[PDB]
Amino acid sequence: DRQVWFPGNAPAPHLDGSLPGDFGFDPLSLGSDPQLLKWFQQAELVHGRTAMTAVAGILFPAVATKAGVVNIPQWYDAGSVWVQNNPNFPFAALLFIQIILTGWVETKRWLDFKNPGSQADGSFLGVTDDFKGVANGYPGGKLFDPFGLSRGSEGQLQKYQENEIKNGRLAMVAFLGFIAQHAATGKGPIDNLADHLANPTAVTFATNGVSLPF
Amino acid sequence: MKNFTTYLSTAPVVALIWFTFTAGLLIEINRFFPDPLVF
Amino acid sequence: RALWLPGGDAPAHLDGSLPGDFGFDPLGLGADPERLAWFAESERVHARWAMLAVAGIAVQEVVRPDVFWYEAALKSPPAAILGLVAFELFAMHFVEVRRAYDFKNPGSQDQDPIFKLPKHEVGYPGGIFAPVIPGDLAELKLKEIKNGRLAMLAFAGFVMQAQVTGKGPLASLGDHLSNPIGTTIFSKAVVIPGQAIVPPCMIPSSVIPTPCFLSGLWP
């Protein structure tokens, strides 16, 4: 069949290859129930898209900071620097705004998961077709896909779905690496990459001092 | 996963989860608001 | 059909009906029909706007060589700027919604609303807008879209050359002609693993904020 995560091992039987990024990986059989599997598919998509946006917003400012053009703080310090620089914007007001905005959009996504296409009735400002949804985790329409890259052809949509899920998983793993590298070095990730590029046989996890506490 | 969630729905597992939640809630209330005698 | 990559294959959704169609759509941005029509209108208006802009910047560099086109709004012939913005917004709003409802309802915006326009193609007005045609329709359409795409590329070059040099386009061309080996972007910008040389942007940070466009990602 398709390529699997562990060659020579049969894929998990509840995974049939229809979902994007199906390499048959479910050794704990967490997706045995199909409805729970759809829920976990939406979980994976939300996690991967959030990870991709966050990894972009860490990497590109850190690359620009490393060049010396700007002085954007590292990702683990940015909240502190923002609060120190914004005394007329309290933390709780920002948190309240974020919670109500994400609550609105996430409750709309949740209610579409419970009842697919039920946000298409025109209750939110007359929007009907753009909130119907194409598939589970893939809204589409003229608002979420204004360039129409999902409505061109089927194979193009499957290609872009594969690109999305693989880059999302890579960005999730990269954010895990960001956390681990900051805990081990106390620096940013582009600082880590530059230190490794300057002297790679000396700049390794084995010489940061915490991965090997000997 | 269905059989596993059915096991997690057995009476002692539900009792463990619910009482862990209730005891943790009481403990954290008394940590954040120490020594409440009166309203 | 002549293709952007000869010996290659054009995408299926680009049949060749539109002028200047060479089967260039690797992202599939025009694979929807209504999106293809809207993007055709957008490419037309972008082409004409950049065409006028490239001509105007070249003339301003030729005619007034003491004025940087980037800072040409400082030297424009103090609260009267708000009224001119109002006049521009009103006139642009009127003509743009006329064009937009020509797109949405073809032929509905084909009559003078004060005292008429012939039946035409969407995005190709004709009538009083086309008094003289020294050529054929498809040929001049191909010339219009080709010159327009060249002008769009040229305006992107004008902007980024103004950022990296602080000078006008023909001055930059003269600097390239003086020293062709030490004036290219390859000559001044180098990134290798472990060391990056990023040229500075001579345009100030603010005057009104005036940021250099993605200067932190320059090579």
Next chain:
Amino acid sequence: ALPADYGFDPLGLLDPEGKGAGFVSPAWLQYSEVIHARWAMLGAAGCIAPEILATAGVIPQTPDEVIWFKSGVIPPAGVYDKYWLDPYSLFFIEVILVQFAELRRWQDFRNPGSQGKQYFLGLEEVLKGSGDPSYPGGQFFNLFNLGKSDLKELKTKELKNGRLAMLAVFGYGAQAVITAEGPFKNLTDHLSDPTGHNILTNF
């Protein structure tokens, strides 16, 4: 039937009945003897070759520092001064690469022929095995096409040299513990003065 079959199984471990599941099955035990044998031949050659070449001046490193147990494998017994990479980063690389090799080999054992199906940069052509886990063969593992008619004799020679190498590696360990010198240093002391340098004098 089996190569190098002397009938020596005093603990009846290769008995087939009842030993169906697990690692005490006959197939796993013959396979494990072969794997131990080949690793032991690499080790028995490799734990004394740097010492021999350093004593003879072929390599410039001193014979004391290229002794197998002082070169970095047991840092309490010594560390070699400045490889191109530190030993723990080398061990990280070793874990990744050797896990790739060993897990692919294991998947050939549990599922014979399965490592020739999925794409592996075209390498899956030569990784189908033969149905015999100890002897995969093919265009790489037997790239010189040896053993056209004496494959059983070559299997016997491989197992005999492997058992000798296994005993030699055990001797390397025992002599390292007893004498704290290299195996070639031990051989040259036994050669130079046989009565005055042996296990009775080292005890």
Next chain:
Amino acid sequence: GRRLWAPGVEAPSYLNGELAGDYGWDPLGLGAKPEALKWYRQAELVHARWAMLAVAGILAQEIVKPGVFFYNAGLPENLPGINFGGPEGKVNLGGLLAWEFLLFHWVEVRRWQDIKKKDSVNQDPIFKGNKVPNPELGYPGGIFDPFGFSNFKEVQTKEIKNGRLAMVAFVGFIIQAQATGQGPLANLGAHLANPFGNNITKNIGTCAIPSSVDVQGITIPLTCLWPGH
């Protein structure tokens, strides 16, 4: 193939002597698929020809200019004295990269389109009368074969065998230059002078190339092909 790379071995079923220089040699089975085999044939052809030009250019550079290391030929002071324009005429290496980058982007994209679809870019884009014949893949001909030297198979075999020799020799050139610090003909002279006292056993442990060099303001890091000291 027919004469194989070793006695007793067998050729793979996909290597039966169709291509030139078929010795039945594929221990890793990389050319088992026809598309991959065709791609690696194109890669081997261009690798062999670049190594041919490289070996013939390194060897001729030592005859004309023995005092300039071919390894150190990239430094600006090791260039020939020619006028690159500007206020002084000194090189920049930015435009030197730029010319080659544009020209090779054009010619290699033309070759790549030829590889993807056979006989698809045979026709001259500007002056449409010109046409390249291209009998097989990697052999365009026409302007590329003016003297018409294409037994095609025998001279193909000569090309691929001399090319494989050139690649092996270029690896020898690079490793010898890194280990000794001298060009290949100086290595030949040194081996001829003191054979037993100057060979690979006296030079393999040293990397004579410096760990970094500075090229007009940018510092390129350098490394040998093995951990020499």
